[PDB]
Write a protein that binds this ligand. Sequence first.
Ligand SMILES: [Ca+2]
Ligand SMILES: [Ca+2]
Ligand SMILES: [Ca+2]
Ligand SMILES: [Ca+2]
Ligand SMILES: [Ca+2]
Ligand SMILES: [Ca+2]
Lengths: 198, 198, 198, 198, 198, 198
Amino acid sequence: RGGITVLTHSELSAEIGVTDSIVVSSELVMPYTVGTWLRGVAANWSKYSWLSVRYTYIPSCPSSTAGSIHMGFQYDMADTVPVSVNQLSNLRGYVSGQVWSGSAGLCFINGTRCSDTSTAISTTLDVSKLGKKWYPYKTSADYATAVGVDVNIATPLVPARLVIALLDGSSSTAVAAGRIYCTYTIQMIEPTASALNN
Amino acid sequence: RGGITVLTHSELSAEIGVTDSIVVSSELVMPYTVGTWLRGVAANWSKYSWLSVRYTYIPSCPSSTAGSIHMGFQYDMADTVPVSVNQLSNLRGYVSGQVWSGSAGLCFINGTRCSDTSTAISTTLDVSKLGKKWYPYKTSADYATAVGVDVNIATPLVPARLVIALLDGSSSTAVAAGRIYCTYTIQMIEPTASALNN
Amino acid sequence: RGGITVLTHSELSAEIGVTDSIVVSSELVMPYTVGTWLRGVAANWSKYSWLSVRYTYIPSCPSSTAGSIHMGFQYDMADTVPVSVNQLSNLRGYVSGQVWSGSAGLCFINGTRCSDTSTAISTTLDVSKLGKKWYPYKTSADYATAVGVDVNIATPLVPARLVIALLDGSSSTAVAAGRIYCTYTIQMIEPTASALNN
Amino acid sequence: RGGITVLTHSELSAEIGVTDSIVVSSELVMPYTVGTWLRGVAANWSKYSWLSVRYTYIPSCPSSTAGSIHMGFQYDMADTVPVSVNQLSNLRGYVSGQVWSGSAGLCFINGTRCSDTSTAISTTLDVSKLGKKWYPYKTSADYATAVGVDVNIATPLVPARLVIALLDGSSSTAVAAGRIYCTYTIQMIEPTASALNN
Amino acid sequence: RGGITVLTHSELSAEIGVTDSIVVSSELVMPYTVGTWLRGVAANWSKYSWLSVRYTYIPSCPSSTAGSIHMGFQYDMADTVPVSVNQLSNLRGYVSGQVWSGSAGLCFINGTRCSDTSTAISTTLDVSKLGKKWYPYKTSADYATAVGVDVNIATPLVPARLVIALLDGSSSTAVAAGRIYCTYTIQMIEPTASALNN
Amino acid sequence: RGGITVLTHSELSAEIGVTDSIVVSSELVMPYTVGTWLRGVAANWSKYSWLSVRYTYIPSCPSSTAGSIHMGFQYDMADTVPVSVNQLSNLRGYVSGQVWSGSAGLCFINGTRCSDTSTAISTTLDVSKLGKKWYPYKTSADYATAVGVDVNIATPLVPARLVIALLDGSSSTAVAAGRIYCTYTIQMIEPTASALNN
Ligand SMILES: [Ca+2]
Ligand SMILES: [Ca+2]
Ligand SMILES: [Ca+2]
Ligand SMILES: [Ca+2]
Ligand SMILES: [Ca+2]
Ligand SMILES: [Ca+2]
């Protein structure tokens, strides 16, 4: 009976800094890597499903801060990570904005009512188009070993990766610009002692 | 047109014995391993889907027989197999009972009408929450080689594993207590010469 | 006009004993062999049809009695009789249970109202799927001579055979465990002097 | 499409004579043996089904003729043929009457409308209760060889046999009393060159 | 409950070659002999019923290939196999055509939608008119032994035989002309360990 | 919003030649391998789904050309490729026909209205029964490396493979017989710079 534990929550996912040259990075879109809170929570369940997953950038810098942020999704971990804004702009859910903009995205995190989100530097995952619905909970280590053998083994383990790019900064030394928060509604099923979850 | 061959049947899946110390084991929940009958039948089809899969324990010992049996499911073969009753109790579909109890589960096997199944030491799979619906028919050998490279390769090959634990026995030497039968309704598709099915 | 004499009744069909090693046996499912009562009654009719035939095991031993009983049906007398519990479990109407269990099956015999039959070690014949509906009344002798020429001659003479297996006992010498009763609703047609019925 | 050729017809089946002592005989109820006409016709078809089969006795002697006739059916050719009027009277469709009576049965042959058939020494087969519906067309020779191996082989080859008994005559030498005609509605299917039909 | 496993499938049944003189042959219409696939599958069940059985000839030769093929059914194995096209033409389901024709019959195999099948050299069994509905699964060996005693023992074991005739070829040495495929919808009941099925 | 780009198109997939001995081959049913056009198009998207995929054989030879073609699908790349027409005939979507036949399949390619397709040597994929709906776009190289580690890694990467067999030819040297075209309706999602798609 039942078996599904649905949870909606937001948490810090990453600290962001800018430099005068492009820096491209990416993170897996799975419970273990979105944040420390969900990592601990979801480990108590064997599998999960994303009903909704969104990454929102919130600025913490002066309006005079130089720089821009870019985000988008990739779904075949075997694919090459973008190396330019041009390539990144082709991805699904691509968003772009000043490193000091994005305040409007706060309402997604708060979960509150909000209309003025045009400037929100926030992107959400197309959960209906993922390889599958239910994925196994995986730890970085186990995952790393798997892709170590062959990247394609990742497909049945993770739905996608968020690609981030930062540039247009005024310093060669990273300047703290903002943070990326992850807001999600996740369904967790088939409980397990967390100690056994790899 | 059509293409689906639906079959409902029960068969012996495992002989059970108890000792005075916990013995944990597990079996894959796939056509090849549930039993000799289905193993032979399903090999004539490329893929299959579990509409229903249940494992029922039927006792064959005196009411004075010491010991208890425990069962539950795991879905990420990379996860560590439980080592204690405590951990096993956390699993989905966990059941527990005296090694001489479980007679009531007979009606599931017989497929007959039955109300008094409260004491039935029988557990059924949550087929709707599996990684996917259609799985490829696999042989132990081929599977073994695959997980040999990396366990995670098992996810797209098998839906789950049944974890069994026996203890509370009165002897250090196994005492025949009962048997575990598997009752299933399986959909088999895309026929193939059995000789080619690995 | 009419011609059908319908009768519903139960009677002793076999005495059961257990040993520490498997003993497989079988009986034909025809009027002459189910029991002494029906044998005498049905001989007064040329043919008959099974509307319902069920074999129920009733225990007569202490709850401390070791052993288990197994039953199932076969329909092609030319087929080899099972030699293991594993094979027997594949048969239609397969039931299994402790040699001291099965009390719940009493209500089928009594014909009374009853809900709690989950533990009943009773199996019923799929009369709708038999080779045919009306079979000739046959005596053991005549039948024996026929299968003596060739087993396949049995197909048009008998609908099926009940296969029984006993094991898990604690003694090499049979221990009286219980009895198998046969409950049936039979239609008898085309009367004949019993003396002429072979 | 279709495939069934239905035919309704009557023809001479046997000449009857009486003596002062019982003479019991029997004939198979199949196309080949009911009469010369149907024997030739039905041989052009592989199988057939009796929709209706009736044997009617028509007298041809003076009202002063001593003797009586008796008829009935048997369905298991392995059964012993009756040896007395007493036994014959137990059979399905048993009829009895004076060797000079039975004129009323003429209307069944003629197929005409008729109410006064109380005295008709005519019996009809319970076609709905036969072993099966479709029987193979068989020749006496082939049949004889089959029952030669074992009588029971006849069950799937013929539906029944008509048992006739004559006695109460006034002479030890047979006196022509009448004739037995067979009226039938037969469905013939799956045509074949008659030369190949055994 | 239930007990019926319905399956619809097509498979190679026979390779066909032509010569300049008639060659008549026949095959039993039972699971074991229609093809290697069904032979293996159906052995896991005690009995079966043909809901539909059709034999389709598919050419594989040039349009210049001389020769014609003929097919039809027989139902009494005791009957003599036809020796001429004339006799074969009398059988139920008789079809005839050029050895290079029959391409249109492909849609029956594919199971696809199709209107233009006038030229299809395909014949289907009149399953409703067979001796019975449920037949026992038999192996060639067991069957051979049975008919060895007497052919008529085959009636309750097999429903019919497909008679094939090839002639009008241009060579005394067989020329590969095409293949005969069998498309069927079969109901299999009363499972059994395949090893016990004779 | 949206995200799905649906496309229906046909293109050359393979050139076909026949010899006097069987030659079995197979191709993966994925965008990269069906043809050069789709290979280039689909590379601009991360994943895709087959709404419909059909392979049609179109002849280009004289009616006097000897030889036949056979096609079917397999879904577990770990399975052994058929080695005989007999084995191939067991596969889902199996079609067979003269190497000079199949003209009728042209309408599937043209997409036009058409009723007379009985002779069309065309087979379509059971897209609803694939392991999953959305697959990642893969290049031959990346795929080759993956199956190089272990074949089973292919399951989450490709839905099936088309198995082709050619024989009955009149020459040991391949004779151009026809071509296989692929007609598909594909949904492409999650765009990406083609250069990054592996
Ligand atoms: Ca895990
Ligand atoms: Ca396989
Ligand atoms: Ca009898
Ligand atoms: Ca015949
Ligand atoms: Ca058999
Ligand atoms: Ca890719």
